[PDB]
Amino acid sequence: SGFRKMAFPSGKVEGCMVQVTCGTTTLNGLWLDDVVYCPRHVICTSEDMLNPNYEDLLIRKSNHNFLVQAGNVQLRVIGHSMQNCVLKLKVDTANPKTPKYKFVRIQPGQTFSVLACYNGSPSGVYQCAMRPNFTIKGSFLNGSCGSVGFNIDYDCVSFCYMHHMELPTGVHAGTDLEGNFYGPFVDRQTAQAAGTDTTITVNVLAWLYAAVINGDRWFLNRFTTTLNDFNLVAMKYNYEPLTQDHVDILGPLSAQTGIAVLDMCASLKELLQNGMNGRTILGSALLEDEFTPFDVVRQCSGVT
């Protein structure tokens, strides 16, 4: 028992982190096979970041201007290209520590682990969700650009995020490993609207099921509701509308607890309408939405 914001073990990703320097700028790169992936803004100077013409900026750069260092050893850059907002630096050596990997674009509401890195060296690992507004509420300081988000399926690492930017609001924006930004964000030092951030309803319900499995059952009531009645309540509280696909995904959790999804919805409705009254659920005084139904089942079944 117990419920914690658990991240995947980070070893397979630590062995991929390198430091990339271009001109005066240093950030992190991801070395997989003979390619180092990094944010393209590594080629920018502070005077360029207001409105950079990356194509023109990249033209003034040659292979030898990209310094890639893996631990203490320098990697030889034999090719460079820009794919959307990432640079791909071809090196002459395949990373011997390259795990089995995939590049995936995650859906909003899905979770992933972030290995925060500085100067190509890992500093920490934490779990987070891609928000419905395509931002992440990470923990990143200067030099963390190029740090990646990932998921692990047994031996395969699915990389889903590369850190690029911190918005003036303190939230983070970045790309998938093909360089496509999640959300409407651009790699430009300009004011950018993140958008209204709603609560991931299917995840809150999964976490309520986790609470029931863990003995926290005070919030359970004698009521039920309908998908449409529940969604009227969810709209008022900026919660994502619950669909039958969401109810289907909560099936194993509903079966394990013997609590119908709509009965749990009625408990959530009452919690939204009445608050916690100073009580806690799984050590929290607010409704947690960064655990998917898969995460709850994983943490409650022990998949390694």
Ligand X SMILES: O=C(c1cncc2ccccc12)N1CCN(c2cccc(Cl)c2)C(=O)C1
Instruction: Please identify every residue annotated as catalytic.
Output: 41, 145
Task: Out of 61, 90, 188, 217, point to the residue binding ligand X (CB under 6 A).
Answer: 188
CA distance 104 to 158: 6
Residue 49 contacts which entry, a second copy, ligand X, none (Cβ below 5-8 A, type-dependent): ligand X
138 binds a second copy (CB under 8 A): yes
Which contiguous run of DSSP H or E holds residue 26? Answer: strand 25-32
Q: Which range of residues in 141-149, 219-227, 233-241, 273-281 is near ligand X by CB under 6 A?
A: 141-149
**Cβ distance 74 to 13 under 8 Å?**
no
Structural contact between residues 225 and 272, judged by C-beta atoms closer than 8 angstroms: no
Which of positions 205-224 make contact with a second copy (CB under 8 A)? Answer: 214-215
Rounded CA-CA distance 65/62 in Å is: 5
Which is closer to ligand X, CB of 96 or CB of 215?
215
Contacts of 203 (CB under 8 A, 6+ apart): 109, 129, 288, 289, 290, 291, 292, 293
**CA-based radius of gyration for the chain:** 22
Euclidean distance between CA atoms 284 and 97, whole angstroms: 39
Residue 293 within binding range of a second copy, rule CB under 8 A: no
Query: Residue 46 Cβ, how far from a second copy at the closest point, in Å?
Result: 19
Residues 1-20: x where in contact with ligand X by CB under 6 A, - otherwise, as a string = x-------------------
191 binds ligand X (CB under 6 A): no
Our finding on whether 51 is near ligand X (CB under 6 A) is no
Contact between 32 and a second copy (CB under 8 A)? no
